[PDB]
Amino acid sequence: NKGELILIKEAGAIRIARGVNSLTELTAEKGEMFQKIKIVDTLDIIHSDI
Amino acid sequence: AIGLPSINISFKELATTVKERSARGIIAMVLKDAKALGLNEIHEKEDIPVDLSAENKEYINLALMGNVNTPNKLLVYVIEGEADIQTALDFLETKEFNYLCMPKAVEADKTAIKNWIIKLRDIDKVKVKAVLGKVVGNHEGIINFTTEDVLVGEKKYSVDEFTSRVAGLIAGTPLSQSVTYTKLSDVVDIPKMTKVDAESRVNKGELILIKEAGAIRIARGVNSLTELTAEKGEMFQKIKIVDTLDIIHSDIRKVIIDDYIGKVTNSYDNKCLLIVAIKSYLEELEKSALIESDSTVEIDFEAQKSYLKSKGVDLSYMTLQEIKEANTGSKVFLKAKIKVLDAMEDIDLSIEI
Amino acid sequence: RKVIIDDYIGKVTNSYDNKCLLIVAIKSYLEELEKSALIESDSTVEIDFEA
Amino acid sequence: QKSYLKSKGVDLSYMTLQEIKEANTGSKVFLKAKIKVLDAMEDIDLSIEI
Amino acid sequence: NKGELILIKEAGAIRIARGVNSLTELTAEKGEMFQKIKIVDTLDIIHSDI
């Protein structure tokens, strides 16, 4: 919940626990989805290509 | 907030539900003794507290024998001698029941019980009944069985002692059938008495035992009230009709208080939903063949108009539909029409050659 | 009279279908009696409308 | 609003209702509204005739 | 009926008496079938596999 990225032991092996970004405050401009790595990455590649 | 990934599997049961309605077939039994005082909760025929007297055990045994089936639940409360009746009466008002009876009682006790029943059926809006040895109480709440020197099992029984057997016989029967003309294999003789006398006693609201056909049978079990007002019609004199009316009242009141009291807003659509629920219950009851097939429920109109006029609102121009639209403020007015069936009692057959 | 008092008194609700069932039972008894050759073959029983 | 305009001494005898509503008030707003508040069902009266 | 599992001498040998579960109260969602060992066991295996 702090935006911290951690490593968790669960099930058989060691797995990453819900990779999220570092930002914590959500403005009316910067919505929730800007916290996911995958979404920000696809936005970046779209920007670069266009 | 973003948390750890959630994977959850939930298992639930298909809670197939039939609504629990008010219990019918319970008997309130009161008796005086110095042992096992208070309620005794004889739910099962076999088990009986042992410290009770043998004669009182015989009274219980007369109480247990059901008409078609055993009574659903028997509640016997033991009271200390000379403790008056009110001490037991509050105890009984604490819990629910259907029929009450006293084998041993003086006429003062019967007067107290009849006054209690009349006040409770109209003040507290609770429908209960009781059988008394010999009273001329003119209410629907009491049934006056009167027959002297009843011989059961080589033993003489007065009317007051036999009232227990009468109450058990009444509670045994289902609501579909009636009590009239039911065999009592236990009794073996009654003092002889003519048919016109039976007509006279029955016309008095008295309940009588008759010797007819091969066996010994009840002769047209009726209520105790005799005067017929413009309010209380003839049908209020039959045990079956008043009993099904009591059941209807209890079920409707329980539903209303349990769900629609203080939990839904008073608006027209909520009124329609309540009407639909009431009609659904009535149709469900009709399926069991206690009332006629077609019944109607509709919001009362004249009472609503009178209530609005009592508030000073001007209702001259608003249409009847708009009148039903009007807000009432936590008050609901409804009227419903039903037709109650009865068991076959008199058959007239005409054959020509 | 014996059949009526034994089965249909104080045990059946007064309704149209119950009356039809009583009619059917009475007609069945009449047909059974007809088999013993005491009455003519065809007999009719129905609800008394005038009364 | 009419009373307030009278209080400042304006002569509104000829001015019509809409024109009275049109007049400037100077940072003053006067509004009135009507509503009807619902309540939960509390008393139920059911009448049955047999 | 008290939710206890008991050992009974009946027929030729000593046998289990209707192996049932320890829960006794019945709620709206916990129905009758949740009292059987076999049913709860197969439910558990379904949960784990899925």
Residue numbers in the entry:
A (entry chain C), E (entry chain N): 204 to 253
B (entry chain B): 2 to 354
C (entry chain K): 254 to 304
D (entry chain J): 305 to 354
Quote what the paper states about this structure:
During contraction, the diffocin sheath undergoes a transition from the alternating conformers B and C to a singular post-contraction conformer. The external diameter of the sheath increases from 19 nm to 22 nm, and the inner diameter increases from 8 nm to 10 nm, which enables the detachment of the sheath from the tube. Four β-strands from three neighboring sheath subunits jointly form the conserved handshake β-sheet. In contrast to the pre-contraction sheath, the post-contraction sheath exhibits evidently subtle motion, as revealed by the three-dimensional variability analysis of post-contraction sheath segments. The helical twist and rise of these segments vary within the ranges of 27.61–28.97° and 25.36–26.72 Å, respectively. The shape of the diffocin in the pre-contraction state mirrors a syringe, and its typical length is about 146 nm. During contraction, the sheath layers of the trunk are compressed by about 47 nm.
Here, we report the atomic structures of an engineered diffocin, a contractile syringe-like molecular machine that kills the Gram-positive bacterium Clostridioides difficile. Specific attachment of baseplate tail fibers to receptors on the surface of a target bacterial cell triggers conformational changes of the neighboring baseplate, which leads to reorientation of sheath proteins and contraction of the entire sheath assembly. Since the sheath and the tube are anchored together at the opposite end by the collar, collapsing the sheath pushes the tube through the baseplate, driving it to puncture the cell wall and underlying cytoplasmic membrane.
